[PDB]
Each structure stands twice: as C-alpha cells, then as structure tokens.
Amino acid sequence: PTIFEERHLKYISQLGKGNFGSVELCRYDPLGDNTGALVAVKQLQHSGPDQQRDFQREIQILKALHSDFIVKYRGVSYGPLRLVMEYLPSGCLRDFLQRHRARLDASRLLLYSSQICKGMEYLGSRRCVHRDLAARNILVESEAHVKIADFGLAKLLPLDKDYYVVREPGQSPIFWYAPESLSDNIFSRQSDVWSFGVVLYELFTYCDKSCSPSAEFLRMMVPALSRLLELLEEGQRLPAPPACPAEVHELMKLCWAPSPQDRPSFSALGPQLDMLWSGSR
Numbered sequence: 001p002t003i004f005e006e007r008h009l010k011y012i013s014q015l016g017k018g019n020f021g022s023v024e025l026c027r028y029d030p031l032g033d034n035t036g037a038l039v040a041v042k043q044l045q046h047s048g049p050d051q052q053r054d055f056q057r058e059i060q061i062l063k064a065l066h067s068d069f070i071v072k073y074r075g076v077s078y079g080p081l082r083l084v085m086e087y088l089p090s091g092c093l094r095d096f097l098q099r100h101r102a103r104l105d106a107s108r109l110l111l112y113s114s115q116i117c118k119g120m121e122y123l124g125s126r127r128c129v130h131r132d133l134a135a136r137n138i139l140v141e142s143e144a145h146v147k148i149a150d151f152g153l154a155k156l157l158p159l160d161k162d163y164y165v166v167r168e169p170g171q172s173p174i175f176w177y178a179p180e181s182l183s184d185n186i187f188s189r190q191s192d193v194w195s196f197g198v199v200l201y202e203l204f205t206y207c208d209k210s211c212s213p214s215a216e217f218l219r220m221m222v223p224a225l226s227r228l229l230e231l232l233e234e235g236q237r238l239p240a241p242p243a244c245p246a247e248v249h250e251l252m253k254l255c256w257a258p259s260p261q262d263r264p265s266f267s268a269l270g271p272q273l274d275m276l277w278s279g280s281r
C-alpha cells in the first residue's frame, strides 16, 4: 500500500544506524503467516524538534523521487513516524565490492559508475543535493544494477540559490568532503561531484580497506580536518587506484578541481563514462 499499519510490520533484524535513525529489516505481514514481503523500515530513535522535521523532509524528498538508480520509496506508517522502503538483500555496495572483487572487471565498475552518475544527474535536476555520497550509501539491486540510498542528510536547494550552508559541523568521515565543505560547510550539486570522485576511487579500489580514502590521507600524513584542508589546498590528491585505467583517474582528478565551478556536471560525466564502458568492451 502507500500506508502501512504498524501492527502488520514485523521485525527481523538491524540493517543500519545513522545520526539518530535506524533502518530495520521487517516483514510486512497482514496475514501473520510469514508469507508477506520484505521491507526496509527507517525510524528515528530520538523525539526532539529539528531531527523530526528533518526526517519528515527526507520522506517528502524520497517520495518525490522516481528513478531506477534511486532507492525506492514504498510508503509510510504512523503511531499517533516510519519510512518504508524497498529492500535490497545484496545490501551495501562497499561490502559487495569487497566480496565479489574477483568477479568484477573494469566494465562493471564503469557500469556502476554510469548508473550512479545517472542517478545523481536526476537528483541534481530535482534541486536535490545528497550531501553524503559514498560507497557505503549505495545499494545493490543486482550484480548489474546499483541505487543511491541514505537521504538522511539530503537538502533541497531553494529556487534562488545553488548552495547550502550547514551551521554545525559534519559528522561523516572527512575524506569524502569537498574543500568548501571542510572550510565553510558549503554543500552543493558540485560538492556532490567532489564526493562522486571519491566513490569512483572506491569502485576502483573495490573499497579495499588497506588503500581506502582514510588509509591514504593517513599515509599522506594538528587537527585532522585542518591537515586534510592543507593537503587538498597544496593540490595533493588520492593516487590512481592499483590497476586503475588512466582515463578514469583523470575523471576523478577532474571531479577534484579546487573550485566547485571547474568541476564537471553529472550530465557532462555521464557520456564520458558511457564511452569508457564501451571502451574496455
């Protein structure tokens, strides 16, 4: 339905945690016989003002999003409150990449890259900045299909502005953040592009822990945030993943253009990745 009765949503396990919200695997079981469909249900675990309004927004946003490459909204449910979503058993991409490594050539990484870019293109066209783009936040619909998830921090851009300024600090691993976010808490469709660069790096390192974004800044060597800012200002960048084809490194480096306005758009990126995907073969 679009509306789920809480009494029929039946609990199975934890799938994830996030700022003040959990997502759970539930069976939606109106018969009560274990034959009902599986669903991923997000609730907030804190009942204050701003986190509750933010959650409502996230629902408004995801409801109004229709794309093969965006996680699918199924409905809400009420108490007097919960967000119900399609469930993707293969789960997290970060993990999926680590497991199936030996089964995935460059085409497929490019295939995923294209699909994520396409979803981000669309997100951008709805004026939606995602703000927390990263392999851990991408779900796997199948071996040849991925989808962007976790709208917990997404913002709508007012009609008259192309950027958002966040008051408090971020709480995500620092290594996916654009410089303007690090220094000024400025997020935009173009800071999303910065992070998409890092997602590509993740695809092509197959999310390996030993050469992760974090592991690399560490190697590349005062507050962490400040040092990462100095580096990125000096023009230090993540290196070509091992075996990475060069053309892809260049796209990354381009996504990492110092100023937001030199970064290419998702709609520029999409064809290039497409050409690359039909290039390997």
Ligand SMILES: C[C@H](NC(=O)c1c[nH]c2ncc(C3CC3)nc12)C(C)(C)O
Binding pocket: 015, 016, 017, 018, 023, 040, 042, 071, 085, 086, 087, 088, 089, 090, 091, 092, 136, 137, 138, 139, 149, 150
């Ligand atoms: C925890 C959160 N997940 C969701 O919102 C999910 C929505 N549908 C899913 N299907 C499988 C999984 C399995 C991967 C848990 N997660 C989710 C996220 C991965 C986006 O941070």
